[PDB]
Amino acid sequence: QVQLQQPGAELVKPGASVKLSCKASGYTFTSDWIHWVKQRPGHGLEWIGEIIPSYGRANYNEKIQKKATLTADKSSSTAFMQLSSLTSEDSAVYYCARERGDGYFAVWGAGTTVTVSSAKTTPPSVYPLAPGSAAQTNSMVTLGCLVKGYFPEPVTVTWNSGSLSSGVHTFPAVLQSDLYTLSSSVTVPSSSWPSETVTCNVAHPASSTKVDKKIVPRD
Amino acid sequence: QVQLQQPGAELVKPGASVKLSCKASGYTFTSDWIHWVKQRPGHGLEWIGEIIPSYGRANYNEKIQKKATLTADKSSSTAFMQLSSLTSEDSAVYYCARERGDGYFAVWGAGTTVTVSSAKTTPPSVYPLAPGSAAQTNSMVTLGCLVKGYFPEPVTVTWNSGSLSSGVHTFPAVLQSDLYTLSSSVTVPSSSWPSETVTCNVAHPASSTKVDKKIVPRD
Amino acid sequence: QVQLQQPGAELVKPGASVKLSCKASGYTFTSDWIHWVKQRPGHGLEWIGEIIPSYGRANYNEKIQKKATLTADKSSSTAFMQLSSLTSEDSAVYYCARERGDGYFAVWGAGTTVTVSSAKTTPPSVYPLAPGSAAQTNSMVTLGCLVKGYFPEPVTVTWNSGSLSSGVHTFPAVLQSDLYTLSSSVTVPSSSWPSETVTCNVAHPASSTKVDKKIVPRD
Amino acid sequence: QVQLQQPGAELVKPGASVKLSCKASGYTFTSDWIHWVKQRPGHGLEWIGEIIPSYGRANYNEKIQKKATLTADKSSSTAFMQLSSLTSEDSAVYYCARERGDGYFAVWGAGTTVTVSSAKTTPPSVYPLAPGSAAQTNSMVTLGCLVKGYFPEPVTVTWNSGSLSSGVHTFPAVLQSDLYTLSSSVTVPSSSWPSETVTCNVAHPASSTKVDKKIVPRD
Amino acid sequence: DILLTQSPAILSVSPGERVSFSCRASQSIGTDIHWYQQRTNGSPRLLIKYASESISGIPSRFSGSGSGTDFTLSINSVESEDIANYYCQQSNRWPFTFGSGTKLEIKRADAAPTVSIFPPSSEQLTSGGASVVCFLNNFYPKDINVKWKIDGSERQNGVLNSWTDQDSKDSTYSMSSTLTLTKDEYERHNSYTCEATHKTSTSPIVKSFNRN
Amino acid sequence: DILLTQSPAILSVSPGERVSFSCRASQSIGTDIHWYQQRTNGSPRLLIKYASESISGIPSRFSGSGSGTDFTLSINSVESEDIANYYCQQSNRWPFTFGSGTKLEIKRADAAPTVSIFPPSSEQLTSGGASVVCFLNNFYPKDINVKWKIDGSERQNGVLNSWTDQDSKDSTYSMSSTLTLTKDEYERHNSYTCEATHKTSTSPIVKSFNRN
Amino acid sequence: DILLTQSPAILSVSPGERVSFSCRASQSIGTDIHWYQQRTNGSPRLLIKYASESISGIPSRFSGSGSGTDFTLSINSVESEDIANYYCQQSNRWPFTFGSGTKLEIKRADAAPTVSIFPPSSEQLTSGGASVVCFLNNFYPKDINVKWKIDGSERQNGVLNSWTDQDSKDSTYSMSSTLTLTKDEYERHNSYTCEATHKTSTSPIVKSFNRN
Amino acid sequence: DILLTQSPAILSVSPGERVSFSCRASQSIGTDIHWYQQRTNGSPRLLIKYASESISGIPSRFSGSGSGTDFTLSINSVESEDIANYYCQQSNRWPFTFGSGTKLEIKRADAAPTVSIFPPSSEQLTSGGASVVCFLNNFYPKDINVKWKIDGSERQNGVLNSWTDQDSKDSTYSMSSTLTLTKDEYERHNSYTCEATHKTSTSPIVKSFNRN
Numbered sequence A, B, C, D: 001q002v003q004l005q006q007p008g009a010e011l012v013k014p015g016a017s018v019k020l021s022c023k024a025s026g027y028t029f030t031s032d033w034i035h036w037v038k039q040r041p042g043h044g045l046e047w048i049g050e051i052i053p054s055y056g057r058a059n060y061n062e063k064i065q066k067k068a069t070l071t072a073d074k075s076s077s078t079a080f081m082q083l084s085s086l087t088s089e090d091s092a093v094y095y096c097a098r099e100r101g102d103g104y105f106a107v108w109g110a111g112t113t114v115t116v117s118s119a120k121t122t123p124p125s126v127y128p129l130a131p132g133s134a135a136q137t138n139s140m141v142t143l144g145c146l147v148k149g150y151f152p153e154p155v156t157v158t159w160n161s162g163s164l165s166s167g168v169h170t171f172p173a174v175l176q177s178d179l180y181t182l183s184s185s186v187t188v189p190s191s192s193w194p195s196e197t198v199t200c201n202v203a204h205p206a207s208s209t210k211v212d213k214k215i216v217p218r219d
Numbered sequence E, F, G, H: 001d002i003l004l005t006q007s008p009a010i011l012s013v014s015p016g017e018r019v020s021f022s023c024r025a026s027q028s029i030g031t032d033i034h035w036y037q038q039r040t041n042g043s044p045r046l047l048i049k050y051a052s053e054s055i056s057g058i059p060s061r062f063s064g065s066g067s068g069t070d071f072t073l074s075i076n077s078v079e080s081e082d083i084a085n086y087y088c089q090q091s092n093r094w095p096f097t098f099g100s101g102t103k104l105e106i107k108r109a110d111a112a113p114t115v116s117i118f119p120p121s122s123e124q125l126t127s128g129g130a131s132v133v134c135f136l137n138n139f140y141p142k143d144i145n146v147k148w149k150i151d152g153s154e155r156q157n158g159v160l161n162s163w164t165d166q167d168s169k170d171s172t173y174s175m176s177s178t179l180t181l182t183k184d185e186y187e188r189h190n191s192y193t194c195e196a197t198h199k200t201s202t203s204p205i206v207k208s209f210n211r212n
């Protein structure tokens, strides 16, 4: 099962402050350490700090400005990082991981995309992309769906809620006037469409949406 | 209170020899070390030696010509550095500092400016600088006073004996034909002058002077 | 006596797998280690691994792709290296050597030339080279014999099965259309030929040949 | 007194072999080591080896060809270095020195100039150099004497057997057709010559000479 | 604190070759190095621990080696699923530290894009905007040009493009180009074409649709 | 003895930026590094001890980090009071040793001088000499030219200038120019002007007084 | 793992000179270095162990020295039997490791080849092929040219050459050039000559035989 | 074995200046360095032991300092008797080792030679040879030219020169030039002159004697 559970997302205003959570399952020892690791986009991994829950002792990277304060609820197996007084510098995916006290990170969360913006949450508009009747075809057909006008990042996009994985491209969002936008491609054999249904599922954790959208041909 | 007390100044002739003093207050331990540190002008800090008073064992920097001999009077809490047979090389501010035997210098004296010269002590002449009646003014006014014809360095200059600190510039002395000279600026709101008095106090420790000088407008 | 005995040769097909042997004589201790060392042609020595027979514990070079598996029959004093799934990369002389647990290789085998080829074993054709009747002579005469159309390497070539060693040149084989070929020179005083017999012995271990060939003058 | 006594000189033929001696006085301990040090001309010092006499254990520089074999007669307080099978490479001053087992060389011999030559010992011819009657003079006068046609090096040259030291120049020998030659200068006040006698003493240890030569004016 | 240097920063290699990633430490750390893999938007995944110890799940293609200050991660015969960033990390002395990372890139055979043009949806139009999407898919090498022409005449306003990193299914690249106008402006034209220019053909691959 | 290297020697930075000073040791010294601050004519003041341990009095802007041979002093958001030299020092092995030092310099907004000309005092004149003082105050950047003109004609004899280092109240610079003559020579002229030329204006700022 | 660097890679020296081979380790290894010798097609042979300890069998010409990270193998007065590759190897820390090796090469006096041309054997001809062999033997220096002429006319088809490495009997080099045709083609010519061009003579050394 | 590097190899300095000689070791050796002095044809003399410990006999001008891998010998106010080579040596690990040495050279005021020409001795002539000696004495700087003229005509045959190293009495240099002929050849000329050309004068200093 998923050993470490973190929120997909958090938006924060400049000078404001956020509390990330990291919940754990599987074998818990009192000798276990939870670590937090920051990754700014298109950058590397940066150790921030660690805590040992069965106590509450925590240590921090001294080589960076100290934004963090770590804590744990030993009852609910949850670790928390208080990130306080953030700036745009502080925007990043923050992972948590678990180390059994023997120095490596066996297991990691999926991480929380933290966006520091004055701007406002906006759910995404989703729209099919079936091809025009003029377009001829091969032994394969390419369908797709277009996620736009959203903020903050991220979104995840699936094809038939996991079952369709071979043949899928999601592109990076592009930001313009404070709304991200992207598209996702999928390619099935033409003989499997539209008899066999094809649907793009789209999660946006910052507004807690998750909308399906079927791709039918054009009327 | 001021933990370490050193003379402002000492003049010495080439080949002559001087005894600097460093007196201590506050928590004294028998495990305490007093250090001496030399700083030639516009240069860095140079460790010279150390002594532990509650004993009289002293060690010296071996990487330099040995000018120093350290001693202490454990009764009067004073440490002494005998600088002997000096040249102009040896002209510098010498600090003393105190280290509790754990390797850092928590506390330092203000240091003794030691000048090695054939030349002669000369107290400073002080003169106002109020502006001419032709000069127009802002919401602020700049007064000043001019310290000249002195030797050796240094002098300190205050404005109303400490109370006026915001708005003050003392310039570095310039030496010409064996007398230093400098000026000090101060800037108050024009509406506070001359109703509210403004006075430059000027200490020259090598001649033990200390003269006030009020700044009135020009008759 | 010859302390370590290895086959001269083994041919293997791409993806196939071979078992080299290294048999030992002389003082055997239970504290002895057998090592294997690879030398690709015109390259250096590369440690592959070691085993201690009186146990069966073996260690391998971690810095290379692991082709080897070591074992021993403590009864027959033989060590084995299983080289598995080879490519042409893996073609090389592999030595075994013995280290008494004090870190150096006192004694080495002669090594096994391992060739990884789709091609087929071919014994060598041998042919004299006595000089033509037109050719005049010195106080020395040069005879020789020509080993050709063989595969895989190697061959050894002797002159009167060891007794003739001064004056001998064997040249490196050259490969063309999947058969190696070479020649070997020998130079005796002219007055010792052909009264005193002169014969080239030629071993090709991959086909288990070994043919003598006398060098008489030309009819 | 002179703690370590070595011969001034030894000549040796290529392939021949010599035994240098180093005799000791002053405080001898059984914990003392004698060292030998080689200095080729216009080169540095090169440690050769050491021995501890009160035992006979000796160690050698492993970084050089081993010409040396060390030994001692504990009875006569003498250490010996057997230099064997020499070449011109091996020509050099060899010092001995004494180290009390605490790593430095408090005391050194004067060293033995060892010359490796096919050539033959030749004592030196000595000749005055008083000035010609045409030559006028200052408050000082320069006399000198000329040591020539000798082999091998060295020679020492004194002026009144030690008493005259201020004002003396001995020049380096120059070698031509297997005989060295040099001169030595001395400069006294003109008023001290020739009333007060002036004499050049000249030792050549390889032929065991030592000749005085007075410097009178020219008849 | 221990500095971990990873060279080179980018490592291009051919399918099936043996590849090696370096990680040098600023002082001797035994074998307390661990190597992680992070795919595009993945989280990291432990591959090798204590420099050479296998983990379960991980293809035997992956091994590690080294001790002291020099470590190597190696992959026997690279393949598409290996396209990722690779990090090293030390536990020898506090604080734990990470290397700056190395990206693996596979040089594959050249491939031409598969182009697909997409009209706006009737859903989208309703809300008063119109975006036309072109997908330039599964090509190699990464460099490509997309041209938009409206009714025979090239347009440059209102176009956003996005390119995927190399793909772990087939070492190819892909690109989406998105043309965005109002309904107003989309209404007063007939023919949209996305043109694509790529090494693999001297002729552009062009794809068009008409509203009428 | 342990050599402590500080780079760079001068560190220019903008107000409010995060800044970092380096101190490298010639062999590993644990965390036995301590950092000091010395303002213009101040004595030194301990800022950080044992590489990262806070001292009381010191703004939390200041932190330190490192261990072994590489240490860093950092200031979160620099500000004017930080203008100083910064030294490092080791207690790991005898004798204690200091680094050569790094000066912090803040690039601020441009500012024009505030000029002020000052007649001699009647006190001074009494003794048989006369010095006229011009103050060029609170400008940025440091480069500036002062010109003296007597009765319309530039004079160069008898002038001494002195410039302050950057000021911890406002990161500006200041300068004093002092013109010194006898009473005799001051008597036989009417009009003294100090002219000042500075980046901030194409026109010089000029300040004059007349004795008559 | 310990890196052992050997410089230089090739070491040319004159007969009887003292020669020295270097082996530098990537960290201090006491005296746990051992030196091996490998002649052309020989297996290796231990020469020196623990940096300086003699082995029995080995001429006293060979010594070793060094400790820590710098080691030297030395030969007093090189001679022909010394022509070989020389390797170093460490046992200080696991795994054992080898240096990349140094080849010794002796510069000797110039020597002209001894040429010898050889007709095919009647044995060979039987099977339907014919190879003529020229031996260019015991020359120095290694560079040499062999020319084949058939009935006065240079041929280039069907020729294979092979050169020996320097020879441990006399520091010379040797070469074999082998001309291979069918019986058919060997039959329709009279005169084969192998010509040899070498530094030692301006005139080529030529050797010929005729079938008729 | 421990390598000891001495820089620079030559150290020129002015009388009375403080001078410093460096000695760097190839690994940390505590304070087990010792410094020796060797004058021209002297044997060496211990100056400083264990890096900084005074020896009795040695002027307090001499001190030493350093520990680990960097050591310094210093002389407060150099003077003529200090002209020598200076060596360092280590006892930290076997074998003991020496540095390659540094020569001290004092730049002094310029001085012109004192020339002196010397006829052969009657003793010498007896044996059937004749050498005339010129001494060029106590000059600075070292570069100088000596010319021989016989009866107005420059001779170059039969001349040997020798130059002293810098002199520990006065930092000057000296030179001897020796002209050697048979009695036969010395007999058939009248006037010998040794001419000397030196920086200090545009006119040569010339010295002559006549047999008649």
Ligand SMILES: CCCCCC[N+](CCCCCC)(CCCCCC)CCCCCC
Pocket: none
């Ligand atoms: C390899 C040095 C040999 C000395 C063995 C004892 N050490 C343990 C203490 C470690 C000190 C910090 C390295 C070193 C003690 C002597 C200090 C000289 C370095 C060896 C510990 C293993 C680390 C060696 C580098």
Ligand SMILES: CCCCCCCCCO
Pocket: A057
């Ligand atoms: C004997 C006392 C042991 C206490 C260890 C706890 C460490 C606390 C860390 O800051």
Ligand SMILES: CCCCCCCCCO
Pocket: B057
């Ligand atoms: C057992 C003797 C201890 C004496 C320690 C005092 C150190 C004096 C320093 O020179």
Ligand SMILES: CCCCCCCCCO
Pocket: C057
């Ligand atoms: C006390 C247990 C000792 C066992 C040692 C055997 C080592 C096995 C290697 O993998």
Ligand SMILES: CCCCCCCCCO
Pocket: D057
């Ligand atoms: C217990 C045995 C001690 C013997 C030490 C002597 C060393 C001899 C050196 O080669």
Ligand SMILES: c1ccc2[nH]ccc2c1
Pocket: E142, E143, E163
């Ligand atoms: C990826 C590929 C091509 C590109 N041209 C300009 C930016 C850019 C990004």
Ligand SMILES: c1ccc2[nH]ccc2c1
Pocket: F142, F143, F163
């Ligand atoms: C400070 C500023 C400007 C300057 N121009 C010449 C010296 C000098 C010093």
Ligand SMILES: c1ccc2[nH]ccc2c1
Pocket: G142, G143, G163
């Ligand atoms: C050995 C000698 C000479 C050569 N010329 C071309 C290859 C080659 C090899």
Ligand SMILES: c1ccc2[nH]ccc2c1
Pocket: H142, H143, H163
């Ligand atoms: C010392 C001084 C000058 C010299 N010119 C040529 C050799 C030589 C030696």
